[PDB]
From a paper:
As expected, no stable [name] particles were observed in solution, as confirmed by TEM, DLS and analytical FPLC. Single-wavelength high-resolution diffraction data was collected in Taiwan synchrotron radiation resource center (NSRRC) and scaled to a space group of P21, with the cell parameters as a = 194.12Å, b = 201.88Å, c = 231.28Å and β = 90.72° at the resolutions of 2.8Å. Surprisingly, although [name]-His-ΔN45 does not self-assemble into particle simultaneously in solution at relatively low concentration (no more than 2mg/ml), the crystal structure of [name]-His-ΔN45 showed that [name]-His-ΔN45 capsid proteins indeed self-assemble into VLP within the crystals. At such conditions, the crystal structure of [name]-His-ΔN45 displayed an icosahedral VLP structure consisting of 60 [name] subunits with clearly observable 2-fold, 3-fold and 5-fold axes. In our crystal structure, the interpretable densities for the [name]-His-ΔN45 start at residue 43Ser, and the densities for most of the surface loops, such as loop-BC, loop-CD and loop-EF etc, are clearly visible and easily traced. Although the extra 20 non-authentic residues “MGSSHHHHHHSSGLVPRGSH” were introduced to the vector expressing [name]-His-ΔN45 protein, the traceable non-authentic sequences are only two residues long 43SH44, which are located within the interior region of the [name] VLP. Remarkably, in our crystal structure of [name]-His-ΔN45 at 2.8Å resolution, the traceable fragment 43GIFNTRL49 (the numerical is based on the authentic sequence NO.) is located along the 1st β-strand toward the interior core of the VLP.
Currently, [name] is the dominant pathogen causing PMWS and a number of associated diseases in pigs, severely affecting swine production worldwide. The [name] [name] is the only protein responsible for [name] capsid formation and the dominant immunogenic host response. In literature, the crystal structure of in vitro assembled [name] VLP derived from N-terminally truncated [name] [name] was determined at 2.3 Å resolution, whereas the cryo-EM structures of in vitro assembled full-length [name] VLP was determined at 9.6 Å resolution. These structures show that [name] VLPs are assembled from 60 copies of [name] capsid proteins with the icosahedral symmetry and several exposed loops located on the viral surface, which may serve as the immunodominant epitopes eliciting neutralization antibodies.
Residue numbers in the entry:
A (entry chain p), C (entry chain r), D (entry chain a), F (entry chain 9): 43 to 231
B (entry chain s), E (entry chain q): 43 to 230
The structure:
């Protein structure tokens, strides 16, 4: 009846070099949607894992640095966990790191170091009120596993210190998902 | 403050005879809405149970067969608990039983045997996301008892093997409802 | 099977000023009928609580005074529990408190004090013999919940000392009613 | 990191005098919205408390009578807790107290008595279905602290008995709020 | 890291009426193949469950009778478990029940009764030699889950007594399968 | 109510390259003012946290180097904790490390190594006498949270060995502050 597993994807992230002489920050964000982890299935089974319900238990975000350990103009930034879908506005060179004081902030060391965050994300159930459940096991909502309109889950704010060089990362995101209700259809012939 | 009780209703259901040779299934669905269990009130008490809030603790679905124990071309099918309001599409003769592999499937025996299911159903709170609470007691959402526009609760998918004969049933649905906040008005 | 609840109604009561000089009392009486607490329902459920039988466990009579704490010509009277439906004849200015010697008498203070009584009342089953059951829990009679012609229960004699001024009360009566046998009918449409 | 705190505001309420001779009740209602307790902030901290999320643990509604203890035509009303945003229709002189039989009812004494209610209110999350969580602690929904458009929380029905006099109160609402996720921005210059 | 589940299918079986007057038996066989339970998937996930390996733990063969409990010319047959893929030759009216003395034989009551067998079947690994493992759990072979042409497992010989009437059945086959090695692909 | 929290800010520091032959030290200093951590408020809540009083428990000073770990001409320097606002005089290239024998000295490794200090700083109460309290919890002076002209706290002296290459750091200063007496004003509208 229940199936625990782990799903992953890796995409590129560049912070383009700047020439601002004062410390600045590249502010951005990250949501998580199961459509980017589970491709569509086939025939009478529209998704590739044949289950009717899911809930995302945990997300791990890993920033795998591309820069060599020889690279200079090293900086210091912040990742914070944003559970209400209310991120700081996307900015190229903000004059301060807007996430540093966040209670959930962790320091990102730049540009040749790993960084990861691991936490329970929340679904965006109503973007007007922006409400979510307390971090939990037994009482977490079950969601329908849809084919294509899956609800955004929510997650992570970032501010990377700008540099005189480019700072490239491979980002790997991994969802620890609990699926429920085996639904495999089996047509004949 | 609380009131636990049980509301029932009965309706007919006929699977119509077919001539298709090979096995085939009549796929349907079932929802439960308190509108059908709870008639309106009168005057200042707009509902027959004078309470402000309720939740549905359990639904029991009973299929009481009409066919006699003598009837042939007996079949086998499935019921499944669908808590997300995403049922298999309605179908007169699907070439397989699309519910048979469901985790929540129970076997239905046809045409002259009883079948029942008993589970906690879920309200349809947002049909786009289709979210629901884990099976629980004290943490279950309370709902407003509305005179008319009450929310669908969600439940049961079905597949009856088609037959050379008609297969008629009386379906008795029973909700075990918890009501809260007695609200009786008493004009003069 | 059992539903224990509480139903209330509030009504006006005025004791009109006099200019008799000698102390004199307004004598009256109080019955309790579920018709006054339970309106009619609609359709196939002719009463507003859908039960077949009932009995009244306790009644509470509250005299809420309207007169201000500054009102003079204070006076003294009596409330008595009368379970046999035989109240003292109603009177405007009787020359004594006809209830002061009753075993169940409690003293009413006038005209700005609260006064409450709490007791098991009895149904008026045969007004000629006027018999009733001893105050008791498991053995108390069950009565059919009628729409229309519910039986009086019986309870309270009052004698308020009259005064140079008007004495006004809001009276709130509360029945603690046990209901039995859920009977809800559910027609279609 | 959480911060518990208490927030208050005070406003007037008047029940205008009437000449209706029979007992009648002024019926109204109270919702609670955090926009009225937390003013707007300044600069890059939009809200005067720099937290990302809140939830309302408790609400105290206090009715502070203005009328002096010498006032006459005293009355008796009702407060009830309404958690589904479905109150009785506002009415100047209803012929009964519509809230007296409510399970959550408390008696209100008029016109010179203090009345409080204290309880967990509920956010108005969908006014079509009007659902809410059972009164809990650690499972309670978290909400985004908005600058402008916060969600009503829901709460209190009232029925005051009408009077030959004006009946004034200062009402003081007080929200016991829990805030979560410190988020202070510190731009430079 | 592992995933137990259950997969089911149903099909018809008819034993056509005869007028041979002395007792005779309709003799047949049953093999089980996971292609019939587990359809193709999509894209880069060629199977509808994304596992690399499986093994079949157990099969249940359920003969659900179609004949009504009123039907006469009732008879008596045999099922047997054949683990080595060597069944008695298919026959219409064999003059004895060739499975009745088999150690694994169970009795089949005809025509209106349920019958089931539940056992560990075996893969057909080499059909010249026809070897198989002792019924086990932790030493049981893993097999690749193929898209295409999965290996038969082996299983059930039947012998139903013939009748003056037709004898129809819905046969339900159920595979308790254990999958291993989640292998889901996720192209962008 | 006490509210315990953390406030940070980051700024650049560059030691400019020299061609002095012999070992020389760039001597400098650091004070901490909450002005630089807490932007102003708005309306009747003139500061971004709404508390009347504060004291600084602890400061973290972090030197996050910019130079790569490949850089040569490495050196060795000193930090020291100066609680009496009496720092060695600022100097481009002093011919010794003036803080090496301080009791509170920690060794700094240059130019690619992190360095931190964590200590209880002291307010500058009277810079004629320069007095401070011994490091404590329950006895530390409370100070008023001012909008504009808060009191320098004091702290850290630095001596970095000069180099043939430049040596940049991002410096992150973090104040662990305890605030007391919630004071939020809530006007209407």
């Amino acid at each position: 009846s229940h199936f625990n597993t782990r799903l992953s994807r890796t995409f590129g992230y560049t912070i383009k070099r700047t020439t601002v002489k004062t410390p600045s920050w590249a502010v951005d964000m990250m949501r998580f949607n199961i459509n980017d982890f589970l491709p569509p299935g086939g025939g009478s089974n529209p998704r590739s894992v044949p289950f009717e319900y899911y809930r995302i238990r945990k997300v791990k975000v890993e920033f795998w640095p591309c820069s060599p350990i020889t690279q200079g103009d090293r900086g210091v930034g912040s990742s914070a966990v944003i559970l209400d879908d209310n991120f700081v506005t996307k900015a190229t060179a903000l004059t301060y790191d807007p996430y540093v004081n966040y209670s959930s902030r962790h320091t990102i060391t730049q540009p040749f170091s790993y960084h990861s965050r691991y936490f329970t994300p929340k679904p965006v159930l109503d973007s007007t009120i922006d409400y979510f459940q307390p971090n939990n096991k037994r009482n977490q909502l079950w969601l329908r596993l849809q084919t294509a309109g899956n609800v955004d889950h929510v997650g992570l704010g970032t501010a990377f210190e700008n540099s005189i060089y480019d700072q490239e990362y491979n980002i790997r995101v991994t969802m620890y998902v609990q699926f429920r209700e085996f639904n495999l259809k089996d047509p004949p012939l």
